[PDB]
Design a protein around this ligand. Structure first.
Ligand SMILES: OC[C@H]1O[C@@H](O[C@H]2[C@H](O)[C@@H](O)[C@H](O)O[C@@H]2CO)[C@H](O)[C@@H](O)[C@H]1O
Ligand SMILES: OC[C@H]1O[C@@H](O[C@H]2[C@H](O)[C@@H](O)[C@H](O)O[C@@H]2CO)[C@H](O)[C@@H](O)[C@H]1O
Lengths: 132, 132
């Protein structure tokens, strides 16, 4: 999937990612981070994957290893359709704004003040990114 | 500058790139391409660089070498301010839509039907990209 690299996504800014979920999707993820074998914020939108149905699984990855999962059952997404999510953060917490207006919080586990990449994975295509 | 990679920018689609020119700019470029040491379309917006003032210099790069320059004196850009450009193409030609409504044409010198990256260089920051 699309990777947007060398971004300067700093404390207090807003990153919006828009796209279209594939018609026949198991899951897709948004992945934000600041170093090559790590992902500070992984947001996995699981229509159906593993033991999860219509569940968001959130995690982080440190040197290619997944950390502790968190889940949300707020799942305002439909296969084949557009979505948009916006992410902001402070030193302690990522704030993920879902398009139904629900907010998920996830810990800023590496204590980052800036990020330099975002990429999509899975059963969706990125159509736009905005950073300001 | 920001690089957007693993895009699928196909014949007939539209790629829009928006950003803000630095307050004190010499030049910035938009660079679209499909292989690692090449740039199919380089659009250099020169406020002042070399012998050029307020000139767009267009070129392509093949295996790290620049090809023949083309110029436009249509220069609807201001240092410190937002800009947006949209690019489309067919097998023969790139069509670059400037925000004053002027269109620049530049040859599709490698005969590409799709591109997989766009990156910004120079004295500007990318704020958004849309691909559909
Ligand atoms: O933690 C994010 C990570 O999850 C992996 O899937 C896990 C799954 O969540 C868990 O229930 C099961 O026991 O193990 C799976 C494999 O580790 C995904 O494979 C990975 O891509 C991330 O999404
Ligand atoms: O052709 C695009 C390429 O131009 C380089 O600058 C040229 C300049 O246009 C030319 O007038 C002068 O004689 O040579 C310069 C150096 O090759 C830029 O340096 C390069 O970044 C591209 O923008």
């Amino acid at each position: 999937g699309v990777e947007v690299k060398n971004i300067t996504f700093k404390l207090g800014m807003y990153l919006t990612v828009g796209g279209v979920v594939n018609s026949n999707a198991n899951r897709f993820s948004i992945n934000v981070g600041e170093s090559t074998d790590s992902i500070a914020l992984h947001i996995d939108h699981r229509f159906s994957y593993g033991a999860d149905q219509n569940t968001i699984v959130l995690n982080s990855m440190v040197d290619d290893g997944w950390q502790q999962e968190q889940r949300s059952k707020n799942f305002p997404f439909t296969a084949g359709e557009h979505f948009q999510i916006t992410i902001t953060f402070d030193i302690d917490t990522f704030y993920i704004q879902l398009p139904d207006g629900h907010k998920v919080e996830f810990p800023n586990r590496h204590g980052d003040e800036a990020f330099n990449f975002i990429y999509l994975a899975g059963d969706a295509r990125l159509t736009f990114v905005r950073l300001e």
